[PDB]
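quick q for whoever's on today - can somebody do inverse folding on this one?? i tried earlier but teh output was garbage lol. C-alpha cells:
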C-alpha cells in the first residue's frame, strides 16, 4: 500500500500541484466555489475584455489594423495559450514521474507531443464552464459567447471542450485521482511516433495504479472502474483530433492567412 500508494499519490499531485494548480477544486471553486462566490474572472465583458486584451495582451502597438490579428488571433492565441502553456506545465509535473525523464529526451516529448493533448483536455473539461472555460490569468475563464464571437473557425475552440466536459465531468473524481490521470495519458502508452514504448507504457502501469488506486480507495465501488473511466479517452482523444481539425483546416487552409512562425512551429513536430 503506502509504497507508491500514498507516496506516488503525494508525488503525482506534488509535482502536479506545482505545475498546474488549476484543478476541479480550483475550477469548480472559482466557477462558484470561491471568487467571493460570484464567478471566476469572467472574460467576455467589456470590463474583463478590457483588463484582458489589454493586460493578458498589453504591448501590442504596430502597423497592423486594416486586416490583421483578428478577434481570433487574439482569442485563438489565448484560448489556445492555455495549451501551449500546459505543455510547459505538464513537463514541470511530468518529469515528476520516476520514469518519464528516465525515458528519452525525444520520447518524453514525443508522448507529450501527442499526449499533452489528452492531458490538457483531460482535466480541461473539468476546468470548463457551461458558456466559458477556466483560464489561468487573474483566475477567470473564457466564455463561449466570447471565443466563438469571432472568426467562424477560431470562433469555436472551446465550446467543444467545455461541452465534452459537461459529459466528461461525469468521470472526474478528485483532482487527486485526476492529477494522476493526466499522467495515465502523459506516459503516451497510446501515442503514435513513440520511442521507448517499453518504458513509456511501463511508467504508465504505475501512474495507472495510483489512479485506480487513490481512486478505488477514495471511492471503492465496482470493478475496473478506472478501466472504464479511462476509456473516456473517446471524448478525450476526440476533442484533440478536433482542436486540429480547426487549426488543421486553417493551418492548411486558413481564412486568409494571419499566423506567425511561433505557430507554424507549435503545430510542426519536434
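ok took a stab at it. sequence:
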Amino acid at each position: 500500500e503506502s509504497a507508491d500508494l500514498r507516496a506516488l499519490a503525494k508525488h503525482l499531485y506534488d509535482s502536479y500541484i506545482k505545475s498546474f494548480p488549476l484543478t476541479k477544486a480550483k475550477a469548480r471553486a472559482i466557477l462558484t466555489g470561491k471568487t467571493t462566490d460570484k464567478s471566476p474572472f469572467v472574460i467576455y465583458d467589456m470590463n474583463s475584455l478590457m483588463m484582458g486584451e489589454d493586460k493578458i495582451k498589453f504591448k501590442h502597438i504596430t502597423p497592423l489594423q486594416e486586416q490583421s490579428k483578428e478577434v481570433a488571433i487574439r482569442i485563438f492565441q489565448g484560448c489556445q495559450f492555455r495549451s501551449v502553456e500546459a505543455v510547459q506545465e505538464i513537463t514541470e509535473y511530468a518529469k515528476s514521474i520516476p520514469g518519464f525523464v528516465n525515458l528519452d529526451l525525444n520520447d518524453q516529448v514525443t508522448l507529450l507531443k501527442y499526449g499533452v493533448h489528452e492531458i490538457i483536455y483531460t482535466m480541461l473539461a473539468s476546468l470548463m464552464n457551461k458558456d466559458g472555460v477556466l483560464i489561468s490569468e487573474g483566475q477567470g475563464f473564457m466564455t463561449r459567447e466570447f471565443l466563438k464571437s469571432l472568426r467562424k473557425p477560431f470562433g469555436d475552440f472551446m465550446e467543444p471542450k467545455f461541452e465534452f466536459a459537461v459529459k466528461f465531468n461525469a468521470l472526474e473524481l478528485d483532482d487527486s485521482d485526476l492529477a494522476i490521470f493526466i499522467a495515465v495519458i502523459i506516459l503516451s502508452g497510446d501515442r503514435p511516433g513513440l520511442l521507448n514504448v517499453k518504458p513509456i507504457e511501463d511508467i504508465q502501469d504505475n501512474l495507472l495504479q495510483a489512479l485506480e488506486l487513490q481512486l478505488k480507495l477514495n471511492h471503492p465501488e465496482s470493478s475496473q472502474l478506472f478501466a472504464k473511466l479511462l476509456q473516456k479517452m473517446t471524448d478525450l482523444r476526440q476533442i484533440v483530433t478536433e482542436h486540429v481539425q480547426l487549426l488543421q483546416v486553417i493551418k492548411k487552409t486558413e481564412t486568409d492567412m494571419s499566423l506567425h512562425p511561433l505557430l507554424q512551429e507549435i503545430y510542426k513536430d519536434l
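fwiw The chain has one domain: 1-270. also The two ends are 39 Å apart (CA to CA). so keep that in mind when u check it
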